Scaffold this active site. Structure first.
Site, PDB file in Angstrom:
ATOM      1  N   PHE A   1       0.784  -1.079  -0.113  1.00  5.66           N
ATOM      2  CA  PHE A   1       0.158   0.082  -0.052  1.00  5.66           C
ATOM      3  C   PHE A   1       0.851   1.268   0.120  1.00  5.66           C
ATOM      4  CE2 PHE A   1      -2.480   3.395   1.811  1.00  5.66           C
ATOM      5  CZ  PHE A   1      -3.254   3.483   1.172  1.00  5.66           C
TER       6      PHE A   1
ATOM      7  N   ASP B   1       9.775   1.945   1.341  1.00  7.86           N
ATOM      8  CA  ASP B   1       8.642   2.915   1.677  1.00  7.86           C
ATOM      9  C   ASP B   1       8.520   2.687   3.490  1.00  7.86           C
ATOM     10  OD1 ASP B   1       6.375   3.972   2.513  1.00  7.86           O
ATOM     11  OD2 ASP B   1       5.200   3.196   0.752  1.00  7.86           O
TER      12      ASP B   1
ATOM     13  N   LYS C   1       3.876  10.932   7.267  1.00  9.11           N
ATOM     14  CA  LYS C   1       2.987  10.545   8.464  1.00  9.11           C
ATOM     15  C   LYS C   1       3.627  11.282   9.626  1.00  9.11           C
ATOM     16  CE  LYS C   1       0.081   6.911   7.312  1.00  9.11           C
ATOM     17  NZ  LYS C   1       0.155   5.823   6.385  1.00  9.11           N
TER      18      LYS C   1
HETATM   19  C1  LIG Z   1      -0.632   5.612   4.099  1.00 10.76           C
HETATM   20  C2  LIG Z   1       0.721   5.214   3.298  1.00 10.76           C
HETATM   21  C3  LIG Z   1       1.208   5.670   2.111  1.00 10.76           C
HETATM   22  C4  LIG Z   1       0.350   6.906   1.393  1.00 10.76           C
HETATM   23  O1  LIG Z   1       0.289   7.916   2.445  1.00 10.76           O
HETATM   24  P1  LIG Z   1      -0.709   9.164   2.342  1.00 10.76           P
HETATM   25  O2  LIG Z   1      -0.112  10.210   3.157  1.00 10.76           O
HETATM   26  O3  LIG Z   1      -2.014   8.622   2.921  1.00 10.76           O
HETATM   27  O4  LIG Z   1      -1.069   9.480   1.082  1.00 10.76           O
HETATM   28  C5  LIG Z   1       2.186   5.362   1.515  1.00 10.76           C
HETATM   29  N1  LIG Z   1       3.152   4.309   2.092  1.00 10.76           N
HETATM   30  C6  LIG Z   1       2.550   3.754   3.232  1.00 10.76           C
HETATM   31  C7  LIG Z   1       3.081   2.500   3.563  1.00 10.76           C
HETATM   32  C8  LIG Z   1       1.680   3.938   3.824  1.00 10.76           C
HETATM   33  O5  LIG Z   1       1.177   3.416   5.012  1.00 10.76           O
END
Ligand SMILES: *Cc1c(COP(=O)(O)O)cnc(C)c1O
Ligand SMILES: *Cc1c(COP(=O)(O)O)cnc(C)c1O
Lengths: 394, 394
Positions: free
Chosen positions: A140, A226, A255
């Site tokens: 994701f 990521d 985040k």
């Molecule tokens: C939520 C998330 C994203 C996308 O982030 P947003 O700020 O919601 O667009 C990308 N990678 C990971 C692992 C995530 O948990």
């Protein structure tokens, strides 16, 4: 307004892209949230790991309030005094040459894909436009058309095609599959989560990230890590990849980079990758703005000054050990690193009753348990008893 | 630090995706910016039209400072008390049923494309995955892989393929071309800017937007109006599309939706479009957070309470009239609506000298002139003389 009033008003005037747990919050501080009726809750979602530092951390709040009176947005058409100070701070922290500032996590992922392709064509010498990027099943990284094209969750992509070409998928936690995939000389990059969050806290085997790094190097492929959810002390290290002492080619952060006070995301990598993108080739109105930059400096300083990686490590051991005492007949699995954890169980009914007992969590038959990293042992043990009361009430 | 120090530090530690005008700002208030040496400048870029309300508008600042002490991010896994109040306010303002909150302008555009395709398949009955979206040459809506796939600017897309399929391009300001394109029954949507901003303030002919609306309705195609730059009083109306009394199927807002204090973007449309997206099908961590929502309420209230549409209209007439007195031999064209304007002239050297004379602008042989909408006539006339001094000094 009451809680039901709040639910009904969003139902009327807001898109139905979410079905939230029926709780309506108005204040948060540290590990706690309060609803409009005044009830207090332990936060065990941490806004998908964006409030690692706890809600409304005063140091991050103070940074926001200071800068907002000065200057909040020039755009990158001009320089401001804050951005470069943030860039120097964050690049040295993670030991990459440069950072590319964006706002959201999916924006950082899009940026990494552009970096990979531009590097694939101009440095590795792949022919236009044959560059491929490999992803792992369960990944994701957001909700754009490119991000859903690499997803293996039909909820994300079904009904939204046609899809971005040049994206290949292999199983997670699978070194032979990665080796087989990288026999293709047109792969430019492999993007992967060190622990898959939205998939249900899927933790790969020991040695997986070491093997990814070796395979990517062996075949001259970029290793994109990521860490938007796993990074920034959540798993008990600065970066989850630190558990295997592995250094990716590109690291994504988001985040908790702001403690939840501002959307700030980051793309870290060395000059041989970053400088494939030239002036005018990648733009974002708010990326790198000075308000978000001050907020992020403070958010990172909090993680370092308060030893939150170490706390998340120690308390995560306690959390998993106690969850393992839950009846095997009801809880089939416990997993996680640091304070990114989950149990396998429906899960929605469980979360409704956890809410009734003062603890907020959300299913993703999987219930995630991810409190802010500023939680103390006694608070954690009190939370654990709510989980026990709830599970054992069925 | 000095200005050169600031330039050099970003050069070392930050990606080179921009080549900013060499000026280093540390404070902004209303129409003015100050650099680190203490020099004062008129802002004639307004951060690409995100500070319509002027820099650090006290009402928007006060909204930020109030909410930041309460609650900044729950994620949409739970409800908060602010989001639905913002949703009800903004939907009624523009007279659509629902809004989908996102953070950046490109995120709103991605969202609209998903809406269009999902609507194309499930309501119009296009077969999966044959849905097409039509765009106009010169369009700009961001920097993701989907957004660059519809661009006709090689700087944006060259070297970043392969590209998103299902995107067709026709000339801007061209009704016969749109009619010919919409003979294809698999078109789900046409997305277009009422005035193209990054293309160089390209203003279409009278009747174009009326003709787009008729053609889209006639062929059951969604009319997506990208007002992320043109909206929110910048052109002298609430929405630029109001000049022709046209109502799009989807309206995009961003930029000035926050007065520059927070990345907030919006997707507005009625239930027959919006409810094609179900729970779990479109996610964003920060979208709809309560801090950004308070900021946006205040940002919108400022535009209404201070009659900034009317001011932008009146002052834009004065600005264009005076720019037209510049020598035809040096300035070949003047264009714009309200306070979104440009002249055609190199333009970089012109902007360096404007900076020397106390006014900040950036080229896109085209120089954009877009001051905050809170500017007063005497301030505008003082700015105009700087433009005159500069142009006439060559
Ligand atoms: C939520 C998330 C994203 C996308 O982030 P947003 O700020 O919601 O667009 C990308 N990678 C990971 C692992 C995530 O948990
Ligand atoms: C800048 C812009 C976008 C993209 O907005 P970001 O916030 O920079 O991603 C989309 N549409 C238009 C007209 C723009 O000017």
């Amino acid at each position: 307004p009451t809680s039901d009033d709040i639910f009904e008003r969003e139902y009327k005037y807001g898109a139905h892209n979410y079905h939230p747990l029926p709780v309506a919050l108005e204040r948060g501080k540290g590990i706690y949230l309060w609803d409009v009726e005044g009830r207090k809750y332990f936060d065990f979602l941490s806004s998908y790991s964006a409030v690692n530092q706890g809600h409304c951390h005063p140091k991050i709040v103070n940074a926001l309030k200071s800068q907002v009176d000065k200057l909040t947005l020039t755009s990158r058409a001009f320089y401001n005094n804050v951005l470069g100070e943030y860039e120097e701070y964050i690049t040295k922290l993670f030991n990459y040459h440069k950072v590319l500032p964006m706002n959201t996590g999916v924006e950082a992922g899009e940026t990494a894909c552009k970096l990979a392709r531009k590097w694939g064509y101009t440095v590795k010498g792949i022919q236009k436009y044959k560059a491929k990027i490999v992803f792992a099943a369960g990944n994701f990284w957001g909700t754009t058309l490119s991000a859903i094209s690499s997803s293996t969750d039909p909820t994300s992509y079904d009904g939204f095609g046609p899809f971005m070409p040049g994206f290949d998928i292999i199983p997670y936690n699978d070194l032979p599959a990665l080796e087989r995939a990288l026999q293709d000389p047109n792969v430019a990059a492999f993007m992967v989560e060190p622990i898959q969050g939205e998939a249900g806290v899927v933790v790969p085997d020991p040695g997986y990230l070491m093997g990814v790094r070796e395979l990517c190097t062996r075949h001259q492929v970029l290793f994109i890590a990521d860490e938007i959810q796993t990074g920034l002390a959540r798993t008990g290290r600065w970066l989850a990849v630190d558990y295997e002492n592995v250094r990716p080619d590109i690291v994504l952060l988001g985040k908790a980079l702001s403690g939840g006070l501002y959307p700030v995301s980051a793309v870290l990598c060395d000059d041989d990758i970053m400088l494939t993108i030239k002036p005018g080739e990648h733009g974002s109105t708010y990326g790198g703005n000075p308000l978000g930059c001050r907020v992020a400096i403070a958010a990172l300083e909090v993680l370092e000054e308060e030893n939150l990686a170490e706390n998340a490590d120690k308390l995560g051991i306690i959390l998993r050990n106690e969850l393992m005492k839950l009846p095997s007949d009801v809880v089939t699995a416990v997993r996680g690193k640091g304070l990114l954890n989950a149990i396998v169980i429906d899960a929605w009914k469980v979360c409704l009753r956890l809410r009734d007992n003062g603890l907020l969590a959300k299913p993703t038959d999987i219930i995630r348990f991810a409190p802010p990293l500023v939680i103390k042992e006694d608070e954690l043990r009190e939370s654990i008893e709510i989980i026990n009361k709830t599970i054992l009430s069925f």
